[PDB]
Design an enzyme around this catalytic site. Structure first.
Site, short mmCIF file in Angstrom:
data_model
loop_
_atom_site.label_atom_id
_atom_site.label_comp_id
_atom_site.label_asym_id
_atom_site.label_seq_id
_atom_site.Cartn_x
_atom_site.Cartn_y
_atom_site.Cartn_z
N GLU A 105 0.84 -1.20 0.00
CA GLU A 105 0.00 0.00 0.00
C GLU A 105 0.85 1.22 0.00
OE1 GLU A 105 -3.04 -0.40 -0.75
OE2 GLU A 105 -3.22 -2.52 -0.16
N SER A 163 -37.94 -52.51 -19.12
CA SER A 163 -38.64 -53.67 -18.52
C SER A 163 -38.19 -53.99 -17.08
CB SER A 163 -38.55 -54.89 -19.43
OG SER A 163 -39.16 -54.63 -20.69
C1 LIG Z 1 -38.03 -54.53 -21.49
O1 LIG Z 1 -36.85 -54.22 -21.38
C2 LIG Z 1 -38.57 -54.98 -22.86
N1 LIG Z 1 -37.96 -54.19 -23.96
C3 LIG Z 1 -38.65 -53.72 -25.03
O2 LIG Z 1 -39.83 -53.94 -25.17
C4 LIG Z 1 -37.95 -52.90 -26.08
C5 LIG Z 1 -36.88 -53.69 -26.78
C6 LIG Z 1 -35.62 -53.13 -26.94
C7 LIG Z 1 -34.60 -53.80 -27.60
C8 LIG Z 1 -34.86 -55.06 -28.11
C9 LIG Z 1 -36.12 -55.63 -27.95
C10 LIG Z 1 -37.14 -54.93 -27.32
C11 LIG Z 1 -38.38 -56.51 -23.09
N2 LIG Z 1 -37.50 -57.14 -22.06
C12 LIG Z 1 -36.11 -57.14 -22.52
C13 LIG Z 1 -35.24 -57.72 -21.43
O3 LIG Z 1 -35.74 -58.04 -20.35
O4 LIG Z 1 -34.04 -57.84 -21.60
C14 LIG Z 1 -36.00 -57.71 -23.96
C15 LIG Z 1 -34.81 -57.18 -24.78
C16 LIG Z 1 -36.02 -59.23 -24.02
S1 LIG Z 1 -37.56 -57.04 -24.67
#
Ligand SMILES: *C(=O)[C@@H](NC(=O)Cc1ccccc1)[C@@H]1N[C@@H](C(=O)O)C(C)(C)S1
Ligand SMILES: *C(=O)[C@@H](NC(=O)Cc1ccccc1)[C@@H]1N[C@@H](C(=O)O)C(C)(C)S1
Lengths: 600, 601
Positions: free
Chosen positions: B41, B349
């Site tokens: 300063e 799913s």
């Molecule tokens: C839940 O994940 C379901 N998926 C679909 O319906 C969409 C989808 C996506 C990619 C491929 C086929 C269908 C069903 N359950 C899954 C699971 O549990 O792995 C699947 C791929 C068998 S379809």
């Protein structure tokens, strides 16, 4: 525990609150406050039931912006409330601050603060913490800040601010969180005199240059503060001899003719219009004017806040103690301290230092110096009256402030020696040029530096350092600092460290008597024979100065505009600055024995 | 005295330094440091100053100097990793310029302004005769020379340590760190290390099958790349027929042989890869920034690749919700983002076990006959994976094959809202759950941590637990100031205003036990690990934009996810059971090794 500022008479003038924390027992917390913090974040993983347990750990320590640590400190800082006095909306506002106490701060960002608050209220409603009746009540609320002022400085504002601003400049905000008691060198009686003197002297200058019109037109009355016994008023009606204005309290008053008749219109610094013949020539309806009462009330007056500024700095010449400091017309108008920060050209107030140095080289007040045109340096400086006088004694040259003799004495003394004395007054290498302009008082000085410089005469040629702290105690009561100043004269402490001598005893004593000759035999107002002083006026009266002393007190006054303009032609140091100095010194030195320089 | 992060198995994993202050005796201060503050300063009113030198002693250890530094020693440590006596004149001047405004002049925030202030001070120091011109020229010519030590040490289990710091700061701000507390987490270090390797290998597995995407940069500087996940940046220097030569960050030149790069089938798209590379010039160009991996001996180098794909793993104890393992992406040094706590994705799913549990609630059984038939919902006729239908089938077959038409039928049977309320009761966000029949096929957005919370309902017998990561907090004195009081699914189970909180029941014991067994048969019939106490469900969203696996045993719930941050297809072959499941198996097998079978009751 705030930073406390006291005067030399142990009187408290300022309290400066820093970091605040008011710890509360968890049970003392309203559930809605806890709920506000629980809804503040979408996901907690320490529903939010474990956040309630961990909240107890942080509730009194959370930084909540603007020096607030913990819920109680934030309730106090933002609203001037206790935690149980807060509304649901206020609780939600504080609840939104922890994440980023600046991006959400209702002071620094009111926009986002509302957005965050309402989001929280929305989340509180979704969580079943608040009912919809409470939701609609709270969400519709404004920010409603009621921030208490924790920086109390209402007695001698420039003195209290001096402590806060200087500690913060050198050491930052942590200097205010220390809870220390600072015992200053300020004399309260002298400080009050200086405050009135600077206010009256500037009002004197202002009144003589005429009415400049209202400070604003069609602007809001809430945006103007009252100060220096002036109160903002919005003009509501204009009649044949009287006007009516609305005050900030809501009342309407009738300013009569005698209260506005002084308002001869301002034409320029050197010109004012004819005396006003009717109130319409002075004010327009919706004009923001300033009014002044009397003793109690009775009648009101139309007044004017000076556009012009001033300062006063008074120091004890034996140790450098700061007794009085006034940085402008009023602290509320401008928090700027012109005594410590107002860099101005000293003009002629510099000459006694340069003429002292001439005396040190072997000269006397009677030595013949030559007032002649000086082309030398392919720059021709001209005297005030554009005249010359020829051979005149050194003392006459100083009194009439003959610019040509100064440049001649600067050539004789040497630019180096002059710069050395200047640096001894607190000046920096970078603020004094090498050129022959230093003989004319063109380099920028702070008035405090001028008071330090003049103290050299008053004390017999010693270098004292200005100082405002006598002692600091910790909140407890322990003295942690005790000022050890450099004394000009150690035996003198009757009515340890020794100051280095900067000017020969004879030269300091001789200049002192020339300065006393200047005040007693030139200009003409006090019943004292122990006073020495010099006036100063810069080119085009851009600055009016007066630097004067007695053996116990050095006072430097200054008058001028912040954006450098002319004060008027017939406006010199002896006209604008001198009346403030006389008015201060007369009162400050009242009932004190004659004290003059000691030729030792 | 920093915030210390420990695991449940008593390992110190992270130290987080907050506000620092290292008080020094005034005599211990170099005079040049005091001189720097003296010249900082222009004017002091408390050539020489003197007054400031006396008042400086009062503040010297407390002055805030930016970036958590309080006092000269803390600033010398924070900015330069030095003691006050180790500082240069230029460094001393830099710190001397900070008190006035520790942000407008901060060298880490505003370097340009910091340099101007510093040199002004040095200039001022020279004018006063504090420093000689030799010292002036030496100092003024110096750069910022910041050597900021990392005070936030987190290099053992980075996602775990960051979880503590980031969460305390989110809820309580920076003051949560400067407390000096000891945080004892729920993290199991053994399990955390397994999860870290599992997520890294599984993503490397997906990446490798998808092919070589080229070098991470070309012609750029090797100093600008960091090593992590056992991958080390190398600048290719020579390309031979069957091999290449690259320059390492240590200065050495390593040789990558054919077997090290032969895997590099070029990436065309998710569904297409180019032919096996025939020569090294097809893989690398000279001046390419590649990533290499040694063996354990450092006697063989491999050309590797950092996945563009991401993943996460979250493992929690189903009885209390304790977080045992958390991995937020491929590597913390690639991305500090934690996908387990912040990665909102469609569950797919992986949501059906929630909806099928409510069907069971109302009165159904795994054996109850449900209808797989074409279902029309407005101007949207959902189609099953294979588009085909199965007519009358038991509820458990419907869940296992993830028959989309039975889901929408079960959603119509239980009611859209009565389901939303249950999905919320499982741990999903009200605003994140739509009001439509697509919530049957997993359209909402969830956090994996929410899925692990939801699956713990089966594992624990239908109780709602909350995920917690703090077991206890102690102060610096050793005093326990916090002790987690979680909601327990089963209070007696631990001994294998109240003292023990009992978690709220969200499912009938029968329906949680029934779903558990449906989930166990999903896993036994087309999974690998030698355990019979594991239940799980795979998930794949439309156009394989997400691969999921949510699985458990009586003592541990693990949810894995694989996908791109900017949602793209993982490829056609890439279902939950293909991309996510291998990470889950790999974790669970190792985590559950040498532990008796633990199943629901
Ligand atoms: C839940 O994940 C379901 N998926 C679909 O319906 C969409 C989808 C996506 C990619 C491929 C086929 C269908 C069903 N359950 C899954 C699971 O549990 O792995 C699947 C791929 C068998 S379809
Ligand atoms: C020093 O202050 C002198 N200033 C000048 O000579 C330049 C000047 C003065 C007035 C107007 C324009 C230029 C002297 N200042 C006063 C004083 O000492 O009070 C004088 C008016 C004597 S000139």
């Amino acid at each position: 525990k705030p930073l406390q500022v006291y005067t030399a008479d142990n009187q408290l003038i300022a309290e400066y609150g820093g970091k605040l924390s008011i710890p509360v027992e968890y049970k003392q917390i309203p559930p809605n406050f806890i709920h506000a913090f629980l809804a503040a974040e979408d996901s907690s993983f320490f529903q939010n039931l474990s956040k309630e347990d961990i909240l107890s750990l942080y509730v009194n320590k959370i930084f909540l912006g603007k020096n607030a640590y913990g819920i109680a400190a934030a309730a106090k800082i933002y609203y001037n409330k206790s935690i149980n006095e807060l509304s649901i909306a206020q609780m939600a506002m504080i609840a939104g601050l922890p994440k980023a106490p600046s991006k959400y701060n209702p002071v620094v960002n009111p926009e986002r603060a509302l957005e965050r608050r309402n989001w929280i209220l929305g989340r509180m409603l979704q969580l079943g913490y608040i009912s919809q009746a409470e939701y609609q009540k709270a969400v519709a609320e404004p920010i409603n800040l009621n921030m208490p002022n924790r920086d109390l400085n209402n007695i001698h504002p420039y003195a209290g601010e001096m402590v806060r601003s200087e500690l913060v400049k050198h050491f930052g905000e942590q200097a205010i969180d220390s809870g220390y008691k600072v015992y200053t060198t300020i004399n309260a009686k002298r400080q009050a005199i200086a405050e009135k003197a600077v206010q009256d002297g500037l009002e004197a200058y202002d009144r003589r240059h005429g009415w400049r019109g209202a400070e604003a037109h069609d602007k809001p009355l809430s945006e103007f503060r009252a100060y220096a016994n002036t109160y903002p008023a919005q003009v509501t009606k204009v009649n044949s001899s009287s006007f009516e204005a609305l005050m900030q309290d809501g009342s309407t008053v009738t300013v009569q003719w005698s209260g506005m008749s002084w308002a001869r219109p301002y034409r320029n610094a050197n010109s004012v219009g004819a005396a006003p013949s009717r109130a319409s020539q002075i004010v327009k309806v919706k004009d923001i004017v300033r009014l002044r009462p009397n003793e109690a009330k009775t009648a009101w007056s139309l007044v004017q806040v000076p556009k012009v500024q001033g300062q006063l700095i008074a120091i004890n010449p034996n140790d450098g103690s700061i007794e009085a400091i006034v940085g402008g017309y009023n602290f509320y108008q401008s928090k700027f301290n012109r005594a410590l920060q107002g860099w101005r050209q000293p003009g002629s107030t510099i000459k006694p230092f340069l003429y002292a140095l001439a005396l040190e080289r072997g000269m006397t007040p009677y030595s013949m110096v030559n007032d002649s045109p000086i082309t030398i340096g392919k720059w021709t400086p001209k005297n005030s009256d554009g005249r010359y006088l020829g051979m005149i004694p050194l003392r006459r040259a100083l009194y009439l402030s003959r610019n040509t003799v100064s440049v001649r004495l600067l050539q004789t003394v040497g630019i180096e020696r002059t710069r050395q004395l200047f640096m001894d007054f607190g000046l920096q290498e970078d603020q004094i040029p090498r050129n022959y302009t230093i003989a004319l008082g063109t380099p920028q000085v702070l008035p405090i530096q001028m008071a330090t410089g003049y103290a050299t005469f008053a004390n017999g040629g010693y270098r004292v350092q200005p100082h405002f702290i006598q002692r600091i105690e910790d909140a407890y009561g322990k003295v942690i600092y005790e000022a050890k100043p450099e004394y000009a004269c150690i035996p003198c402490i009757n009515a340890y460290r020794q100051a280095q001598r900067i000017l020969k005893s004879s030269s300091a004593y001789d200049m002192a008597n020339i300065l006393r000759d200047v005040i007693e035999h030139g200009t003409g107002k006090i019943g004292r024979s122990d006073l020495g002083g010099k006036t100063g006026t810069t080119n085009d009266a851009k600055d009016a100065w007066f630097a004067g002393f007695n053996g116990k007190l050095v006072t430097v006054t200054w008058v001028g505009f912040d954006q450098p303009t002319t004060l008027g032609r017939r406006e010199y140091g002896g006209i604008a600055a001198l009346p403030i100095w006389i008015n201060f010194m007369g009162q400050a030195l009242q009932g004190t024995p004659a004290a003059w320089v000691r030729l030792e």
